[PDB]
Amino acid sequence: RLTELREDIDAILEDPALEGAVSGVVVVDTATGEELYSRDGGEQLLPASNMKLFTAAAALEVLGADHSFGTEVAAESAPGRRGEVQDLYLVGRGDPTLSAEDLDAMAAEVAASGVRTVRGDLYADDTWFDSERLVDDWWPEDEPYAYSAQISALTVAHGERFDTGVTEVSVTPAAEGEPADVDLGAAEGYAELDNRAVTGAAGSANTLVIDRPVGTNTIAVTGSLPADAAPVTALRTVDEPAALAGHLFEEALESNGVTVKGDVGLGGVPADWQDAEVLADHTSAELSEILVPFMKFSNNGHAEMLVKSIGQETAGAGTWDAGLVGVEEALSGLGVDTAGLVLNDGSGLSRGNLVTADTVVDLLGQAGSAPWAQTWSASLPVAGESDPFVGGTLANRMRGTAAEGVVEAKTGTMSGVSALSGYVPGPEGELAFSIVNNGHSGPAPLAVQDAIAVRLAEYAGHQAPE
Protein backbone atom coordinates (compact mmCIF):
# COMPACT_ATOMS: atom_id res chain seq x y z
CA ARG A 1 0.00 0.00 0.00
CA LEU A 2 3.13 2.17 -0.22
CA THR A 3 3.24 2.08 -4.06
CA GLU A 4 -0.23 3.67 -4.22
CA LEU A 5 0.97 6.47 -1.91
CA ARG A 6 4.08 7.20 -4.00
CA GLU A 7 2.05 7.42 -7.23
CA ASP A 8 -0.48 9.75 -5.57
CA ILE A 9 2.26 12.12 -4.31
CA ASP A 10 4.05 11.91 -7.71
CA ALA A 11 0.80 13.10 -9.34
CA ILE A 12 0.21 15.89 -6.78
CA LEU A 13 3.68 17.25 -7.61
CA GLU A 14 2.72 17.43 -11.33
CA ASP A 15 0.90 20.70 -10.54
CA PRO A 16 1.24 23.62 -13.02
CA ALA A 17 1.82 25.82 -9.93
CA LEU A 18 5.11 23.90 -9.53
CA GLU A 19 6.32 24.54 -13.10
CA GLY A 20 9.91 25.84 -12.93
CA ALA A 21 10.01 25.22 -9.17
CA VAL A 22 12.34 22.91 -7.27
CA SER A 23 10.71 20.89 -4.50
CA GLY A 24 12.19 18.72 -1.74
CA VAL A 25 9.70 16.17 -0.42
CA VAL A 26 10.63 13.66 2.28
CA VAL A 27 8.33 11.38 4.29
CA VAL A 28 9.76 9.08 6.97
CA ASP A 29 8.16 6.73 9.50
CA THR A 30 9.57 7.92 12.84
CA ALA A 31 8.51 4.67 14.57
CA THR A 32 10.33 2.22 12.29
CA GLY A 33 12.82 4.44 10.40
CA GLU A 34 11.27 3.63 7.02
CA GLU A 35 11.74 6.31 4.37
CA LEU A 36 8.34 6.28 2.65
CA TYR A 37 8.95 9.03 0.10
CA SER A 38 12.07 10.83 -1.11
CA ARG A 39 12.43 13.43 -3.89
CA ASP A 40 15.46 15.75 -4.00
CA GLY A 41 16.00 15.09 -0.27
CA GLY A 42 19.55 16.48 -0.23
CA GLU A 43 18.73 19.52 -2.38
CA GLN A 44 19.69 22.81 -0.71
CA LEU A 45 16.71 25.18 -0.60
CA LEU A 46 15.42 28.34 1.06
CA PRO A 47 13.37 27.28 4.13
CA ALA A 48 11.76 30.66 4.88
CA SER A 49 10.04 30.20 8.28
CA ASN A 50 10.93 26.48 8.45
CA MET A 51 14.26 27.87 9.77
CA LYS A 52 12.36 28.44 13.06
CA LEU A 53 12.20 24.66 13.53
CA PHE A 54 15.99 24.68 13.91
CA THR A 55 16.02 27.91 15.98
CA ALA A 56 13.32 26.66 18.41
CA ALA A 57 14.97 23.23 18.93
CA ALA A 58 18.32 24.93 19.71
CA ALA A 59 16.62 27.39 22.10
CA LEU A 60 15.13 24.48 24.05
CA GLU A 61 18.50 22.72 24.07
CA VAL A 62 20.58 25.75 25.10
CA LEU A 63 18.11 27.76 27.22
CA GLY A 64 15.80 24.99 28.48
CA ALA A 65 12.00 24.81 28.50
CA ASP A 66 11.95 26.47 31.94
CA HIS A 67 14.01 29.52 30.87
CA SER A 68 12.51 32.96 31.49
CA PHE A 69 13.60 36.53 30.64
CA GLY A 70 14.24 39.53 32.91
CA THR A 71 13.67 43.29 32.77
CA GLU A 72 14.59 45.65 35.61
CA VAL A 73 14.62 49.30 36.68
CA ALA A 74 17.81 50.64 38.30
CA ALA A 75 19.04 53.79 40.06
CA GLU A 76 22.52 54.46 41.50
CA SER A 77 21.12 54.47 45.02
CA ALA A 78 17.75 53.98 46.71
CA PRO A 79 15.43 56.99 47.16
CA GLY A 80 15.66 58.81 50.52
CA ARG A 81 13.18 60.88 52.53
CA ARG A 82 12.71 63.25 49.55
CA GLY A 83 11.95 60.33 47.22
CA GLU A 84 14.74 61.41 44.87
CA VAL A 85 16.92 59.61 42.37
CA GLN A 86 19.04 61.21 39.65
CA ASP A 87 19.30 59.14 36.42
CA LEU A 88 17.17 56.00 35.99
CA TYR A 89 17.73 52.92 33.83
CA LEU A 90 15.28 50.54 32.22
CA VAL A 91 17.38 47.42 31.58
CA GLY A 92 16.12 44.78 29.16
CA ARG A 93 17.53 41.26 28.99
CA GLY A 94 15.88 39.84 25.89
CA ASP A 95 12.22 39.42 26.88
CA PRO A 96 10.25 38.81 23.66
CA THR A 97 6.87 39.31 25.42
CA LEU A 98 7.31 42.56 27.37
CA SER A 99 4.01 44.47 27.37
CA ALA A 100 2.97 48.08 28.03
CA GLU A 101 1.11 46.80 31.07
CA ASP A 102 4.31 45.15 32.31
CA LEU A 103 5.93 48.61 32.02
CA ASP A 104 3.05 50.03 34.14
CA ALA A 105 3.48 47.42 36.92
CA MET A 106 7.22 48.19 37.09
CA ALA A 107 6.37 51.92 37.12
CA ALA A 108 4.05 51.23 40.07
CA GLU A 109 6.89 49.30 41.79
CA VAL A 110 9.17 52.33 41.29
CA ALA A 111 6.50 54.48 42.97
CA ALA A 112 6.01 51.94 45.81
CA SER A 113 9.78 51.83 46.44
CA GLY A 114 9.55 55.52 47.35
CA VAL A 115 10.56 57.31 44.16
CA ARG A 116 8.60 60.52 43.50
CA THR A 117 10.98 62.51 41.30
CA VAL A 118 13.41 61.16 38.73
CA ARG A 119 15.62 64.28 38.85
CA GLY A 120 17.86 63.20 35.97
CA ASP A 121 17.34 61.43 32.66
CA LEU A 122 15.64 58.09 31.96
CA TYR A 123 17.83 55.69 30.00
CA ALA A 124 16.82 52.73 27.89
CA ASP A 125 19.46 50.03 28.32
CA ASP A 126 19.49 47.22 25.71
CA THR A 127 23.24 46.46 25.83
CA TRP A 128 22.60 42.76 26.71
CA PHE A 129 22.35 42.22 22.95
CA ASP A 130 24.45 44.19 20.46
CA SER A 131 23.02 47.20 18.60
CA GLU A 132 22.90 45.36 15.24
CA ARG A 133 19.25 45.95 14.43
CA LEU A 134 18.85 44.08 11.14
CA VAL A 135 20.49 41.09 9.44
CA ASP A 136 22.87 41.97 6.61
CA ASP A 137 20.92 40.58 3.67
CA TRP A 138 17.41 41.56 4.87
CA TRP A 139 15.62 44.04 2.58
CA PRO A 140 15.41 47.81 3.40
CA GLU A 141 11.94 47.88 1.76
CA ASP A 142 10.69 45.28 4.30
CA GLU A 143 11.61 47.60 7.21
CA PRO A 144 8.23 49.31 7.81
CA TYR A 145 6.58 45.89 8.38
CA ALA A 146 6.24 43.89 11.62
CA TYR A 147 8.16 40.90 10.26
CA SER A 148 11.24 43.13 9.77
CA ALA A 149 11.19 44.85 13.18
CA GLN A 150 14.57 45.91 14.61
CA ILE A 151 16.18 43.50 17.06
CA SER A 152 16.83 44.65 20.64
CA ALA A 153 17.25 43.24 24.16
CA LEU A 154 14.74 45.90 25.24
CA THR A 155 11.59 45.85 23.16
CA VAL A 156 7.86 46.31 23.75
CA ALA A 157 5.65 43.53 22.38
CA HIS A 158 2.15 44.39 21.10
CA GLY A 159 -1.01 42.36 21.82
CA GLU A 160 -1.72 38.68 22.63
CA ARG A 161 0.70 37.62 19.88
CA PHE A 162 3.66 39.68 21.16
CA ASP A 163 4.65 41.49 17.97
CA THR A 164 7.82 43.33 19.00
CA GLY A 165 9.35 46.67 17.92
CA VAL A 166 6.07 47.86 16.41
CA THR A 167 3.29 50.36 17.03
CA GLU A 168 -0.33 50.01 15.97
CA VAL A 169 -1.40 52.76 13.57
CA SER A 170 -5.15 53.42 13.29
CA VAL A 171 -6.50 55.48 10.39
CA THR A 172 -10.06 56.80 10.67
CA PRO A 173 -12.07 58.75 8.12
CA ALA A 174 -13.43 62.24 8.89
CA ALA A 175 -15.74 64.28 6.67
CA GLU A 176 -15.11 64.02 2.92
CA GLY A 177 -12.28 66.43 2.06
CA GLU A 178 -11.00 66.68 5.62
CA PRO A 179 -7.77 64.85 6.50
CA ALA A 180 -8.15 61.32 7.81
CA ASP A 181 -7.36 60.92 11.51
CA VAL A 182 -4.13 59.04 12.13
CA ASP A 183 -3.56 57.50 15.56
CA LEU A 184 0.08 56.32 15.90
CA GLY A 185 -0.60 53.99 18.88
CA ALA A 186 2.15 53.52 21.49
CA ALA A 187 4.60 55.51 19.28
CA GLU A 188 2.60 58.75 19.79
CA GLY A 189 5.11 61.43 20.88
CA TYR A 190 7.94 59.11 19.80
CA ALA A 191 7.68 58.55 16.04
CA GLU A 192 7.09 61.47 13.66
CA LEU A 193 3.80 61.83 11.75
CA ASP A 194 3.56 62.77 8.08
CA ASN A 195 -0.19 62.68 7.38
CA ARG A 196 -1.02 63.43 3.74
CA ALA A 197 -4.10 61.18 3.78
CA VAL A 198 -7.56 62.58 3.04
CA THR A 199 -11.09 61.29 3.54
CA GLY A 200 -12.66 60.41 0.21
CA ALA A 201 -16.35 60.41 -0.65
CA ALA A 202 -18.61 57.70 0.78
CA GLY A 203 -18.19 54.68 -1.51
CA SER A 204 -14.91 55.89 -3.08
CA ALA A 205 -11.92 53.56 -3.41
CA ASN A 206 -9.63 52.90 -0.42
CA THR A 207 -6.12 53.81 -1.59
CA LEU A 208 -4.56 54.36 1.81
CA VAL A 209 -0.87 53.55 2.26
CA ILE A 210 0.98 53.55 5.59
CA ASP A 211 4.81 53.54 5.38
CA ARG A 212 7.93 54.31 7.42
CA PRO A 213 10.40 55.78 4.89
CA VAL A 214 13.83 54.13 5.03
CA GLY A 215 16.28 55.62 7.53
CA THR A 216 13.54 57.64 9.23
CA ASN A 217 11.36 57.31 12.33
CA THR A 218 8.49 58.97 10.45
CA ILE A 219 5.14 57.31 9.76
CA ALA A 220 3.96 58.57 6.39
CA VAL A 221 0.29 58.22 5.55
CA THR A 222 -0.79 58.82 1.96
CA GLY A 223 -3.90 58.10 -0.12
CA SER A 224 -7.64 58.22 0.54
CA LEU A 225 -9.98 56.58 3.01
CA PRO A 226 -13.67 56.78 2.02
CA ALA A 227 -16.04 58.44 4.52
CA ASP A 228 -17.95 55.16 5.04
CA ALA A 229 -14.84 52.99 5.39
CA ALA A 230 -14.12 51.09 8.58
CA PRO A 231 -11.00 52.18 10.52
CA VAL A 232 -7.77 50.78 9.08
CA THR A 233 -5.19 49.33 11.48
CA ALA A 234 -1.68 48.26 10.56
CA LEU A 235 1.30 47.23 12.65
CA ARG A 236 4.31 49.34 11.68
CA THR A 237 7.84 49.13 13.11
CA VAL A 238 9.62 52.03 14.83
CA ASP A 239 13.28 53.03 14.78
CA GLU A 240 15.09 52.08 18.03
CA PRO A 241 12.68 49.71 19.85
CA ALA A 242 14.37 50.36 23.23
CA ALA A 243 13.85 54.13 22.93
CA LEU A 244 10.10 53.60 22.41
CA ALA A 245 10.20 51.31 25.49
CA GLY A 246 11.95 54.17 27.32
CA HIS A 247 9.34 56.62 25.97
CA LEU A 248 6.44 54.38 27.09
CA PHE A 249 8.05 53.88 30.53
CA GLU A 250 8.37 57.64 31.14
CA GLU A 251 4.61 57.73 30.54
CA ALA A 252 4.05 54.69 32.79
CA LEU A 253 6.04 56.47 35.57
CA GLU A 254 4.14 59.75 35.10
CA SER A 255 0.84 57.85 35.21
CA ASN A 256 2.10 56.32 38.50
CA GLY A 257 2.91 59.60 40.26
CA VAL A 258 6.62 59.75 39.39
CA THR A 259 7.85 62.97 37.76
CA VAL A 260 10.64 62.78 35.16
CA LYS A 261 12.48 66.10 34.87
CA GLY A 262 15.05 65.19 32.21
CA ASP A 263 15.30 63.54 28.79
CA VAL A 264 14.71 60.02 27.46
CA GLY A 265 17.29 58.16 25.37
CA LEU A 266 19.54 55.13 24.98
CA GLY A 267 22.35 54.43 27.44
CA GLY A 268 23.83 51.51 29.37
CA VAL A 269 24.18 51.35 33.16
CA PRO A 270 27.51 53.11 33.79
CA ALA A 271 30.52 50.98 34.77
CA ASP A 272 30.85 53.68 37.49
CA TRP A 273 27.81 52.38 39.37
CA GLN A 274 29.11 50.55 42.41
CA ASP A 275 25.85 48.95 43.58
CA ALA A 276 22.89 49.65 41.30
CA GLU A 277 19.67 49.72 43.30
CA VAL A 278 17.05 47.63 41.51
CA LEU A 279 13.73 49.40 42.13
CA ALA A 280 11.57 47.22 39.86
CA ASP A 281 11.70 43.98 37.86
CA HIS A 282 9.58 41.75 35.63
CA THR A 283 9.86 38.07 34.72
CA SER A 284 8.39 36.56 31.56
CA ALA A 285 6.59 33.27 31.15
CA GLU A 286 8.90 30.33 30.56
CA LEU A 287 10.18 29.55 27.06
CA SER A 288 7.85 26.51 26.75
CA GLU A 289 4.87 28.91 26.81
CA ILE A 290 6.66 31.62 24.79
CA LEU A 291 7.08 29.03 21.98
CA VAL A 292 3.33 29.06 21.22
CA PRO A 293 2.84 32.63 19.86
CA PHE A 294 6.34 32.34 18.39
CA MET A 295 5.76 29.15 16.33
CA LYS A 296 1.98 29.32 15.75
CA PHE A 297 2.09 32.75 14.10
CA SER A 298 5.72 32.54 12.94
CA ASN A 299 7.21 35.46 14.95
CA ASN A 300 10.46 36.70 13.36
CA GLY A 301 11.42 38.97 16.27
CA HIS A 302 11.11 36.09 18.75
CA ALA A 303 13.42 33.94 16.61
CA GLU A 304 16.24 36.52 16.32
CA MET A 305 16.00 37.48 20.00
CA LEU A 306 16.18 33.77 20.93
CA VAL A 307 19.22 33.47 18.64
CA LYS A 308 21.03 36.30 20.45
CA SER A 309 19.83 34.91 23.80
CA ILE A 310 21.58 31.65 22.81
CA GLY A 311 24.72 33.71 22.07
CA GLN A 312 24.48 35.14 25.58
CA GLU A 313 24.02 31.72 27.17
CA THR A 314 26.82 29.95 25.29
CA ALA A 315 29.28 32.86 25.02
CA GLY A 316 28.11 35.98 26.89
CA ALA A 317 27.55 37.75 23.56
CA GLY A 318 24.06 38.86 22.40
CA THR A 319 25.15 38.52 18.82
CA TRP A 320 24.04 36.86 15.55
CA ASP A 321 27.52 35.41 14.84
CA ALA A 322 27.71 33.76 18.27
CA GLY A 323 24.02 32.84 18.35
CA LEU A 324 24.06 31.11 14.95
CA VAL A 325 27.15 29.02 15.79
CA GLY A 326 25.28 28.34 19.05
CA VAL A 327 22.27 27.07 17.06
CA GLU A 328 24.51 24.89 14.84
CA GLU A 329 26.39 23.40 17.80
CA ALA A 330 23.14 22.73 19.68
CA LEU A 331 21.67 20.95 16.64
CA SER A 332 24.80 18.75 16.40
CA GLY A 333 24.63 17.70 20.08
CA LEU A 334 21.00 16.80 19.42
CA GLY A 335 22.25 14.27 16.82
CA VAL A 336 21.47 16.28 13.67
CA ASP A 337 23.74 16.13 10.59
CA THR A 338 24.19 19.85 9.84
CA ALA A 339 26.10 19.36 6.56
CA GLY A 340 23.32 20.94 4.42
CA LEU A 341 22.41 23.75 6.82
CA VAL A 342 23.42 27.32 6.05
CA LEU A 343 22.43 29.54 8.96
CA ASN A 344 22.10 33.27 8.29
CA ASP A 345 19.38 34.09 10.80
CA GLY A 346 16.90 32.54 13.25
CA SER A 347 13.57 33.42 11.59
CA GLY A 348 14.14 32.34 7.99
CA LEU A 349 13.58 35.92 6.78
CA SER A 350 17.13 35.93 5.33
CA ARG A 351 17.51 34.57 1.81
CA GLY A 352 21.03 33.45 2.83
CA ASN A 353 19.51 30.54 4.73
CA LEU A 354 19.65 27.06 3.23
CA VAL A 355 18.28 23.76 4.48
CA THR A 356 17.51 20.44 2.85
CA ALA A 357 14.31 18.43 3.33
CA ASP A 358 16.41 15.58 4.79
CA THR A 359 17.92 17.96 7.38
CA VAL A 360 14.41 19.09 8.38
CA VAL A 361 13.19 15.46 8.65
CA ASP A 362 16.37 14.62 10.60
CA LEU A 363 15.54 17.41 13.08
CA LEU A 364 11.91 16.22 13.31
CA GLY A 365 13.09 12.74 14.33
CA GLN A 366 15.67 13.99 16.85
CA ALA A 367 13.26 16.52 18.38
CA GLY A 368 10.55 13.86 18.65
CA SER A 369 12.49 11.84 21.24
CA ALA A 370 13.99 14.86 23.07
CA PRO A 371 13.01 15.55 26.71
CA TRP A 372 11.31 18.78 25.54
CA ALA A 373 9.35 16.93 22.78
CA GLN A 374 5.86 17.82 24.06
CA THR A 375 6.40 21.57 24.49
CA TRP A 376 8.11 21.58 21.06
CA SER A 377 5.13 19.70 19.56
CA ALA A 378 2.57 21.93 21.31
CA SER A 379 3.95 25.08 19.63
CA LEU A 380 3.39 23.61 16.15
CA PRO A 381 0.34 24.77 14.15
CA VAL A 382 -2.42 22.14 14.02
CA ALA A 383 -4.12 21.73 10.62
CA GLY A 384 -7.55 23.33 10.27
CA GLU A 385 -8.11 24.53 13.84
CA SER A 386 -10.27 27.67 14.21
CA ASP A 387 -8.58 29.05 17.34
CA PRO A 388 -5.58 31.11 16.08
CA PHE A 389 -3.55 29.97 19.12
CA VAL A 390 -4.11 26.34 18.08
CA GLY A 391 -4.26 26.45 14.27
CA GLY A 392 -1.95 29.42 13.71
CA THR A 393 -0.75 29.70 10.11
CA LEU A 394 -2.74 26.48 9.43
CA ALA A 395 -6.07 27.68 10.87
CA ASN A 396 -7.72 28.29 7.49
CA ARG A 397 -6.07 25.29 5.78
CA MET A 398 -7.12 21.60 5.51
CA ARG A 399 -10.47 22.20 7.26
CA GLY A 400 -12.89 19.27 6.83
CA THR A 401 -10.11 16.85 5.83
CA ALA A 402 -8.44 13.74 7.30
CA ALA A 403 -5.66 16.15 8.27
CA GLU A 404 -7.85 18.41 10.43
CA GLY A 405 -6.92 18.25 14.12
CA VAL A 406 -4.01 15.81 13.64
CA VAL A 407 -1.28 17.20 11.35
CA GLU A 408 1.14 19.42 13.30
CA ALA A 409 3.31 21.33 10.85
CA LYS A 410 5.37 24.49 10.51
CA THR A 411 4.86 26.83 7.56
CA GLY A 412 7.48 28.76 5.59
CA THR A 413 6.37 31.69 3.44
CA MET A 414 8.18 34.17 1.18
CA SER A 415 8.32 35.20 -2.50
CA GLY A 416 9.02 32.03 -4.45
CA VAL A 417 9.51 30.15 -1.16
CA SER A 418 6.89 27.92 0.49
CA ALA A 419 7.24 25.15 3.11
CA LEU A 420 5.21 22.71 5.21
CA SER A 421 7.01 20.41 7.65
CA GLY A 422 5.86 18.43 10.68
CA TYR A 423 4.21 15.22 11.91
CA VAL A 424 1.25 13.00 10.96
CA PRO A 425 0.40 11.12 14.21
CA GLY A 426 -1.89 8.19 13.33
CA PRO A 427 -2.70 5.01 15.36
CA GLU A 428 -0.24 3.26 13.01
CA GLY A 429 2.73 5.57 13.64
CA GLU A 430 3.76 9.23 13.88
CA LEU A 431 4.90 10.23 10.39
CA ALA A 432 7.47 12.97 9.78
CA PHE A 433 7.55 14.97 6.56
CA SER A 434 9.20 17.99 4.98
CA ILE A 435 7.90 19.80 1.88
CA VAL A 436 10.05 22.71 0.66
CA ASN A 437 9.28 24.52 -2.62
CA ASN A 438 11.49 27.12 -4.32
CA GLY A 439 11.15 29.20 -7.48
CA HIS A 440 7.46 28.98 -8.33
CA SER A 441 6.18 32.09 -10.13
CA GLY A 442 2.46 32.03 -9.32
CA PRO A 443 0.61 31.38 -6.04
CA ALA A 444 2.28 29.48 -3.19
CA PRO A 445 1.79 25.74 -3.79
CA LEU A 446 -0.44 25.43 -0.72
CA ALA A 447 -2.93 23.09 -2.41
CA VAL A 448 0.02 20.80 -3.22
CA GLN A 449 1.22 20.94 0.39
CA ASP A 450 -2.32 20.48 1.75
CA ALA A 451 -3.00 17.59 -0.66
CA ILE A 452 0.18 15.74 0.34
CA ALA A 453 -0.39 16.28 4.09
CA VAL A 454 -4.05 15.18 3.73
CA ARG A 455 -3.03 12.06 1.77
CA LEU A 456 -0.47 11.36 4.52
CA ALA A 457 -3.21 11.49 7.15
CA GLU A 458 -5.28 9.04 5.05
CA TYR A 459 -2.26 6.71 4.81
CA ALA A 460 -1.88 6.99 8.61
CA GLY A 461 -5.55 6.00 8.85
CA HIS A 462 -7.42 9.22 9.51
CA GLN A 463 -10.89 10.30 8.43
CA ALA A 464 -12.30 13.75 7.67
CA PRO A 465 -14.36 15.18 10.59
CA GLU A 466 -18.04 15.48 9.65
Ligand SMILES: *[B]([O])([O])[C]([C])[N]C(=O)C1=C(O[C])[C]=[C][C]=C1O[C]
Ligand atom coordinates in the same frame (compact mmCIF):
# COMPACT_ATOMS: atom_id res chain seq x y z
B1 LIG B 1 8.10 32.95 7.78
O1 LIG B 1 8.27 32.69 6.28
O2 LIG B 1 6.60 32.94 8.07
C1 LIG B 1 8.72 34.35 8.18
C2 LIG B 1 10.11 34.51 7.58
N1 LIG B 1 7.92 35.37 7.57
C3 LIG B 1 6.99 36.18 8.07
O3 LIG B 1 6.66 36.32 9.25
C4 LIG B 1 5.96 36.10 6.98
C5 LIG B 1 6.23 36.92 5.89
O4 LIG B 1 7.50 37.65 5.84
C6 LIG B 1 8.28 37.85 4.66
C7 LIG B 1 5.31 36.91 4.85
C8 LIG B 1 4.12 36.17 4.96
C9 LIG B 1 3.85 35.42 6.11
C10 LIG B 1 4.75 35.42 7.18
O5 LIG B 1 4.51 34.61 8.37
C11 LIG B 1 3.19 34.25 8.80
Ligand SMILES: [Co+2]
Ligand atom coordinates in the same frame (compact mmCIF):
# COMPACT_ATOMS: atom_id res chain seq x y z
CO1 LIG C 1 3.54 58.65 24.01
